[model samples]
Target: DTNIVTLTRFVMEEGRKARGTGEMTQLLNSLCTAVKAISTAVRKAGIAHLYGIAGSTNVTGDQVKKLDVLSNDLVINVLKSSFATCVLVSEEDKNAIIVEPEKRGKYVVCFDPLDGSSNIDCLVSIGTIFGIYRKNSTDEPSEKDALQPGRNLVAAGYALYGSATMLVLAMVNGVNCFMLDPAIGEFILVDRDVKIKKKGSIYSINEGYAKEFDPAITEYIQRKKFPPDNSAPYGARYVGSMVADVHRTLVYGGIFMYPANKKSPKGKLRLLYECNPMAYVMEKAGGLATTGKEAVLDIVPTDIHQRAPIILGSPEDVTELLEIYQKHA
Candidate 1:
C-alpha cells in the first residue's frame, strides 16, 4: 500500500512540474516525461523489445525481427515526443534519433527500450532502463555517446512493469522508489531515501557460466559456496533476469554481478542504459558498481550498444569481491 501510494504521488508531481527552467531542471523533467510515457506505453502494449547486439551466438535473426517490431517504432516514438531536443540512442536503433536538433543540444540519452523481452512470451516480467547526461562540451554526441559509462550520467532510472509497476530513480541528492497506480496512472513517492544495507552477505551471479569466467570470478564464487565457520557466509541467487536479480540484491542486501566471462568478450549488459543507470541507482543507495577491475561509471563509451561487466549492490560485499578478484590477479 505504501509503495503504491508513494509511486502515484511521485508520478503526479513529476508530470505536473514545468520544464526548460535550467539544465538540471530540464534534465529531470525530461526524465520524468520519459518515465511517464514508458508507463503509458507498457500499459497499452502488452510487450516490448530488449534490443542489443549479438552475432550468431548471443542472439538470432528471428529474435532481432521480433525485437524490431516491439521496440523500434513504438517505444522510440513515445520517447521522442515526451522529451524535447533530445538525441536518443538505444540498443535497438543502430543510429541516433535526433528529435529537435536545436533544442536537444544539451543532453544525450541512452536506453534499453525493453529488457528481457525473451521472457515476454512466457508472461514473465520485464521493464525499461535509461541513463542521461550532458553532452560532452567539445564532442558532439555521435552514435558513440550512447555507450558512455555510468559515471557520466546526470540522472538514471528504471521502470518495472510486473504485477505492480514501479519506478526507481536517483540523481545527486539520493535514491528513491515510486509505485505506479494503474487506476490513476500516477507514480507516488514510496521511499523518500532508499539506502542499501551496510553489511550484506549475499551474492548474485550466473555460476553456471563459471567455466567461461575468469579464474578470479570462479575463485570468488567458490569462496561463497564454501566459507569457513568464522567467516561470514553469503547466499547465492541468479534469476537470469537483470531487473529481478538486481532488485532483489538492492532490497535484500547482496552483491549482484554479470561479469565478462570468456563467452561475452565485452560483458553481457549494455553500458549506456542498463549498466550505467542501475549503477547510478546502486551508488546513490550507498552501494558500489564496478567492472571487476575498475569503477563502472569511469568507463567511457566507444559504441552505442557496448557491453560491460557489472558488479553492483551492497558496498562491503562488492569491495570484498573486488579484493578477491585482485588476489587472483
Candidate 2:
C-alpha cells in the first residue's frame, strides 16, 4: 500500500545520493530478489525433489543440500545480471567468481546463499548472510582484496527466513530492520535507526559445549544474573542456526558467542560469511563485536572463509563476557 514504507522506496529514495547510483541500487534490488526467491522456495521446501540432500559436497565438505545448490545458483544468476560487483564469493563456491572480468564493477559481494540449510529437513530457522564492499580506486583484483576486514564494507546485512522473513541492514548512519510482507511482496520498514539497549536479557550459545569452554566462558554463564549484572536471570536460546541466533542477539539485545573450545580452537564459523557482516550490523546498532582480544572489524582475514571465535552483542552484555586465560581459583 501507499502507507507502507517499503525497502525499495527507501533504497530508491537513497539512490538520489552519490553512492546509491543505479548500480548500487540495482545490486540491492538484485540481492532482495535473490533472497525473495530463496524465501519462496524455502516456504515450499518439502515438495517434489526439493527436500533432501544434493548428493554433493561444498568446499567445507559438508553435504550440500538441495536448497543449498539451488539457492546458490539463483543468487549467482541474479547478481551476475546486476553486475554491480567485481567479485562474488559464495559459501558453496571453492573460489570467488569474477562476475566482471575487467574489474570495472563497483563492489565486491560475498555471501552465504543458504546459511544453516543442512537443517532443512529439521525445519530450523535459516537464512542468508552477506557483506558488500565498494572497490577502491586503483584496487587490483586478488583473493586478499575480497578478504578485507569488515570495516571496509559499504553495506552488510542478513535476510532471515523464520516464521517471519526479515532483513536487517547496516550503514554508517545506523542499522535498520525490514519485514517481508508476502501479501504485497515487499519488505516493509519495521524498525528505524535501531539502537540496541545497553544490556540484554539473553545469552545465545550452544550449551552442549559448556564443558569445552574455557574456565572464563564457563564462569560467565554462572554469573548471568542480569539484575546485579543488568538483565538478571538471563536465559539461553540457540537454534543451531547462526542467522537465527544472531538475529535474536541483534534485535533483543544480548550476547551471542561462538567461541573456540577443545574441538575447534580456531573457531567453527567463517569470519567472512558468519561473523563480520553481523559484526558490522551490530556495531552500527551501538553493539560491540570482538574476538576476545580484538574487534571483529579489526581482524585482517588471511583466507576468504577463515574461521574465528566471535563474541558480540550489547556493549554491556559483551563486556560481561569473560575470555581471560586465568585458571579457576
Candidate 3:
C-alpha cells in the first residue's frame, strides 16, 4: 500500500488544486473504469468474436467496427451513471448527449472511444482519447457547452491498448503516465511530470497522401527527407492511428501531422474529440500543437464534429513547420 500510487489517489490530490467539490474526481474515476472495460474488450476481441464491422458509419463517417460500438457504449454508459457530467460528446454519436437533469453534474466530456479501430483486426495498437471541460453556465447543458476551445480544457487524456495498456493524463499543472497493473486491476502511476525534448529527429504522417498535400506540407516533408545541412535525415513513422502516432511523439521526440489536403480540405481529425485533447496533452508536457496558422487550442468550435489540420509535437519542429506554412500563405 505504501508503494502504490493509483489513479484515484492522483485525481484526489489534483482535485484540490481547483478547490473542486469532488465532482471532477468522480468523473475521472468513472472514466478510469471505462478505460479498463474498453481494455478488457480489446484484449479479448479475437477470442470473443467481437471483430468486423457493424455496417454503419459513425457521425464522423468512419465505419463502425464491432469493437468501436462496444467501446463507445462502455464509455457512454459509465460516464452517464457517474453523475458528475452534464454533456457527453462522442465520435460515435451524431449529436451531443445532454445528460438527464436528474443525472446532471458539472462537466462536458468529449471522446473518441476507439481511436484506432481500423487496426483492431491486425492486433495493432489502438486507444481512446478524451477531453473534459467545466460547464460554462448553470443552466441546462447544450451542445455549446461541449464546443469550448481547447484552451478551456480542464483535463485531457488517452488510454493506449498496446502490448500493455497505458494511460496518460494531462491536467492543469502537469502530465502523468499510469500503467495498468493486471495483477491488481488498477492503474499504477509510473511517470510524473513527463516532458518532451524541445526538438526531435522523427516525423509522423501518412506520406502516401503526399501528392494531395498542400505545397507547404510537401516542402516540409522534402526538407525532412533531405535536410539542408546534409546531416542524417529524420526518420518517418506513421501508424495511421492518431493515438499511437501522438503517443510516440510525446514519448520520443517528433512532429505528427494530419494536414489539410486537396481531398479533405478542412483536415481529417475531429477538432473537439481528437485535436483538442491531444493538444492539451502535448502542451502540458512542454511540447506544442498547432493548426498551421494558429495554436490548436485557440480555435473555437462552430460544430461539435468540426475538423482541422493538426501539426504538433516538439516545439522546435512545430515552429519550423509553422514557419513554412506561414511563408506559403
Candidate 4:
C-alpha cells in the first residue's frame, strides 16, 4: 500500500528494525497520548483557568505559571497510565519524578511541559520539547539515565501548538514531521526523513540581549547575519517562544541564537528540556547546533536542569558563527 503511514505505524516499523516493538511501542503510545492531551489543554485556553502564576518556582527561579503545573501534571498522568516510563524529569518539578516506580519497559523522559507560557496570555504559539532514553540497566531507570547528552537520546521530539498541532521527531534513523489530525485523533506522517536547508536567509535571535552578547556573537551578527544592503534586508523573527522560533528555522532555512549573557552566564535554555532535544532534531535534519565553542551534543551534563548557550539551525548559518567564536571568543 502506497499511502501515508500514521505515527504509530511509523514508530512501530522503526522498532521492528530492532526486532522489538514492545518497548518502543509503549513509549511512543504514551508520548502520543500526553501530547494529544496537551494539545487539548492548549486549545481550551481561557476556559480552563490555565493562565497566571502557580504557587511555586522552578529550579531556575522562573515563576511557575498555573498552566505550567497543569501541563506538567497532565503529561505525567498520561505517561503513568501506560506505565511506559520509569523516570520523568520536567522543567516544572524540582526533582526527577518516578512515575511507575517498579519500571516496566525501563524508559526515561525529559520534557518542558509548556514553553513560552507567558505568551499564552496573548494567544501566541507555545509548545512542548522532550527527549527520551532507555534505562541503562535491566532494572528501573534513574536520575543518571535522565541526564544524558543529546547524542545519547534514543528518541527526541517537540510538539508545536500554533495554527495546527505539529510534531517533529528524531528516532536515530532520521528526523520526521507529523501533524495531529483531530478528525481521527492520530498523528499522520506528513514529512519523512526531512532535510533542512544548508543556508538560510532568515535569522532568529533575541535582540534584547544583543549588547550583552560576547563581541564574537555581536560581531557575527553585524557582519554575516544582517541582510545585504542591496534590496530586501535579511529576515528577523523572534516570537519569545523557543519551540516556535526553532520550528520555523527547521522548516525554512534559518538560524536561531540563544547565548549566555550577564544575567544568565550558563544560558537560559535548559540542556535537557530545550537545547538537547531541539539540537538533536536540527542536527538530524542536515543542520548544525553548537554551543559557540563546541558541539551542543558533546557536553556531558552534571545537572538535569543544566543550561548552555545554543546557536542552531541551518548548517551554513551555524558554521559562520562558530568560525567567529573560534577567532574572537
Candidate 5:
C-alpha cells in the first residue's frame, strides 16, 4: 500500500510547499469526498429512482435534474464544512454563497455540480467540474472573489463518472489523473504529469449544427472532414458530454470544441463552472485552450454565469482551429 500513491498522499506531499499548505489539501479532500458521493449516486441512479428532472430551473434557466440538486447540495455542504473555502459559486445557484466570516478561508470555488446533465437520462458520461482560486487579499467574501480569470486558478479539476470514476487534477506544474479504487474507497494516482501530444487525428464537435455554426467553426470542421491535401481526415467524435469529449482529447490528443453558433453567439458553456476549469486542465496538460478570439485563461469573467465558446485540446489541433478562426474573423 505504501507503493501506491493515493490522492491524500499526493496532496500531502505537495503540502510541504508554502502555497500547498494543509488547508489546500483539506479543501481537496473535501472535494474528493463530495465527488465520491456523487459518483455513487450516479451509478445507483436507476435503482435509487434518482433519474428524471427535479422539476425546477437553475440560475441559468437549465432544467435541474434530481441528481443535479443532490450533487450541488453535497458539494456545497462538504466545501462549506471544510472551512477552507470562502466563496462558493455553483451552476445550480443564482448567486454565490459567501461563507460566514467566522468560517471563511482563502479559497474561492466555482463549480458545476453536474455537467452534461442533458445526457444523464441516456446514461451517458457526466461529470463535476471545479476551479479553485485564492482570495485576493483575503477580504470579506464577495462575488469578485470568484470572478477572476482562469489564469488565477490555484487549481482545477473534474470528476468523470464513466465506466470508471476518474478524477483529473490540474495544478500549476502539471495535470494528474486518479481513479477510484473502490475496494479501498480512495482515489489512487493512475497517471502523473499527464501530457497531451502536440497533434492528434481526432476532432470533436456536434456537426448536426454545422449549418448554424460560425464561419470559422464551419470551415474548421470542413477541413477536418476533408483535408485540403486529401489526406485521411481526422476522425469525428462527439459524445455530447463535455467531460467525456475533453477527457478523450486529453488522453488521446485531439480537439474538443463548443463554439458559438447562430442561436448562441456568445456560446453555451458557463465561463466559471465549465469553460475555465476545463481550459485550465487542458492548458496545464501541455495542451491549449481558447475562445477562438482569445485565450480562455486571460478572459476575466464579468458574471458568474457568463457563457463563452470553448475550443481546447492538443496544441497543434487547437492552433489549427485558431488559424481558421483568424482567417474568417
Candidate 6:
C-alpha cells in the first residue's frame, strides 16, 4: 500500500533534517545500505537452510560463514565508503582494523558479526548485534570508552533474521524498528518508537547453575517459588542462547540472567558487543539492565572479551533482584 520510492525519498529528507545540515547525508545512506545488506543476508541464509536438524553439515557451517562474512564486509565497506570511519572492531576479527589509513572518524564500532551461530544449524532465529560510540583521542579504546553506559551510545541496534528480517535501532532521541522488503531491498518504517510491555510475569535464568550463583541469587529464586505470603507466582524460561533468551524477554517482558558464577568468576557475556548493545536497547525501551552489582552499561570495557553479569527486563523484576542482593550480600 505504501509508495516505495516516495517513502525512500521521505526517509532521506527526514534523515537529513534530523541529522542537521552538513555531510551527514552520507552517514544516512551508509546506514540504509548496511541495513539492506544484512537483511538480504538473513533472507538468503534462512531460505537455504533446514530447521531443527541435529547433525552438523557443510550447509550449516556455510550459512554461518556467509553471515559472518556478509556482516563484517557490509559494516567495513559502509563505514569506509559512507561514514569515512577508519577503525572498526568485528567479533570475527582478533583485533581492530583500520579501514582507512589516514582518515579516521571520531567513532568506532564493536559488534558481534553473527550472534546465535549455533541456532543456524537448527534453523532457529538468530541476529546481529552492534554498538557504536565515539572513539577517544587515543588510537586505543580505554575502559572509559567501553564503560560508557547506555546513555553514551551513539547507535545501538540488532538485526533480527526471522520470518521477516527486522532492524531495530536506538539513536540519541529514541528507538525505531524497520522491516526489510526483500523484493526491493529497502527498509520500510514499521514501529517508530517500539516499547516493551511492563509487568512481565516471566523470568529467565539457568536453573542448572543454581549451585554456582551467589547466595543472593539463590535466595531470591527460592523466595520467588515460596514467597513469604505465598503470593508471587511467575513463569520461568531459559533458552541458554543469548539472542533467543533476550528476544523472548523483549517480546514477553521477563528477566534474563547470565550472572557471575564461581565457575567463571568474570561472567559470561562480552561487554562491547553483547551486553552494551542489549543494555542500550532495553533501557531505551523502558526496561532495566544490570550486571548484578552495577549497571551493565556503567562497566567500562577493559578487554575485547571482557565478561559481566547481566540481568535485565521489567523494572519490577530487576528491583526485586537488587533487593535480594542487598539483603544477602
Per-candidate TM equals 0.82, 0.92, 0.98, 0.94, 0.97, 0.81
| lDDT string, candidate 4, 2-99, tens digits | 56588888888767757863776777777788888889988986898777888888898888887887788878877666667888889987788876
List ranges where model 5 is wrong by over 4 Å: 19-21
Q: How well does model 3 score by local distance difference test? A: 0.91
Lowest lDDT 10-residue stretch of candidate 1: 53-62
For every model in order, what is the number of clashing pairs?
15, 5, 0, 1, 0, 2
Model 4 accuracy (lDDT, Cα): 0.84
* lDDT scores in order: 0.70, 0.82, 0.91, 0.84, 0.91, 0.70
RMSD of each: 4.6, 2.5, 1.1, 2.1, 1.2, 4.7
State the lDDT at 311 in candidate 4. 91
| Residue range 1-329, candidate 1, lDDT tens digits | 44444443453455455544355444444455555665565555534343343332222122443433455455566555544335787767666777664455466777776676666555466677877776664555466555556677777878776677777878776878777766765667767778999767788887778779898788778778788565866877766668777777777888898998887877878887789889999999999999999988888877766778999998888888899888887
Which residue pairs overlap in candidate 4's backbone?
227-234
Query: 1-329 in candidate 2: lDDT tens per residue?
Result: 55878887787675566654467777878888988989999998887558888899877677888899889998888888886777788889889887656434678888998898656888889999999887765655655558788899888999999999998878777888899998877889999999988988888888889879877777777777434546448887888888998888887888998888878876788888778999999999999988766788888888887888999899987876744433432
- As a whole number from 0 to 100, the lDDT of residue 216 in candidate 5 is 87
lDDT value, candidate 5, whole model: 0.91
Candidate 2 CA-lDDT value = 0.82
lDDT of 1: 0.70
CA lDDT of 241 in candidate 5? 88
lDDT, residue 32, candidate 5: 95
